[PDB]
């Protein structure tokens, strides 16, 4: 969770380069000229009348390297190395066409970063999974639809292939991984029909809040009971919080309530 780049705006690499390599008198992030001394007044007047032209090459390269840092194509500690290498290359092949290409690349990378600021793996997994079963092609179809809906609506969830099996993980740094291949292999003999492994039990518990299934089928009954259990768990959490907060005006009290409550 460390800041990838120094600038206050993680996106807009041009803005980040503005923040890093520009004087803090032109920037904006949100006196009495005439009483100033003669030297300052004359310097400001001359600079205003005849503005000093400067090369926007180092700024462009800094914006590019900030974009690369944001994209993670360049590690944090080699930013200076890449900056110097890019400056050397640009100076070696400097031209108006090269400057135009640099500006175009900065604009394109800024747009791409702004636009950007698992599904294909699930599609491949569904493709390798058989789509026809001899025990009702509606429970399977609705379950697949629920799985796709939940993986799409999950904020940070990953589906990936690890050798010969496909896995589903609820979060990047979590501890809830479901072997989808084995779960569906276990579920296949009993679509339309205690005997389920913990992997497929966890899959069902995860998909229950995000699910068309006919209630007559075994999977329908299991999903209804899992929904009921999850609702009981939420209401039990609310009751536990209320009881504990009231009883704290003892860890032994938490022990007693949890034991009586589970």
């Amino acid at each position: 969770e460390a800041p990838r780049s120094l600038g206050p705006a993680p996106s807009n690499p041009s803005l980040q380069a503005l923040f890093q390599s520009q004087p803090s008198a032109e920037q904006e992030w949100h006196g009495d000229f005439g009483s100033q001394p003669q030297a300052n007044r004359f310097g400001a007047i001359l600079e205003a009348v005849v503005p000093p032209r400067s090369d926007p090459t180092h700024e462009k390269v800094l914006a590019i390297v900030n974009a690369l840092l944001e994209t993670q194509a360049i590690r944090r500690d080699e930013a200076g190395q890449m900056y110097t290498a890019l400056l050397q290359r640009v100076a070696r092949y400097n031209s108006v066409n090269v400057q135009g290409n640099l500006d175009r690349l900065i604009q394109d990378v800024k747009e791409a970063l702004a636009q950007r600021e698992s599904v294909v793996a699930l599609n491949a997994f569904l493709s390798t999974q058989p789509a026809v079963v001899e025990r009702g092609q509606e429970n399977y179809v609705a379950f697949v639809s629920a799985l796709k809906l939940m993986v799409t609506e999950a904020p940070q969830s990953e589906v990936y292939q690890a050798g010969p099996s496909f896995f589903f993980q609820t979060s990047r740094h979590g501890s809830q991984t479901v072997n989808l291949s084995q779960a569906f292999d276990n579920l296949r003999p009993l679509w339309g029909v205690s005997l389920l492994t913990p992997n497929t039990r966890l899959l069902l518990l995860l998909i229950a809040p995000f699910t068309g299934i006919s209630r007559d089928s075994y999977l329908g009954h299991l999903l209804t009971l899992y929904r009921e259990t999850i609702g009981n768990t939420r209401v039990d959490e609310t009751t536990y919080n209320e009881i504990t907060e009231v009883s704290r005006a003892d860890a032994s009290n938490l022990q007693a309530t949890l034991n009586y409550l589970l």
Binding site: Q81, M82, T84, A85, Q88
Partner: protein
């Protein structure tokens, strides 16, 4: 047998037709022609000196 002089072992090796190899990699292994410390300094355009 007894009635003999005492020992004083001396050891030495004899290596022929071999060059002493000191690889540039940090772990002295050869995991590729371009060593990792060769990839370092590749775009650093530094000079250093060897002594």
């Amino acid at each position: 047998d007894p009635r003999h002089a005492l020992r004083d072992p001396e050891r030495k090796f004899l290596c022929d037709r071999t060059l002493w190899r000191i690889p540039f990699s940090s772990n002295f292994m050869s995991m590729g022609s371009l060593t990792d410390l060769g990839q370092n300094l590749l775009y650093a355009n530094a000079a250093h000196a060897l002594d």
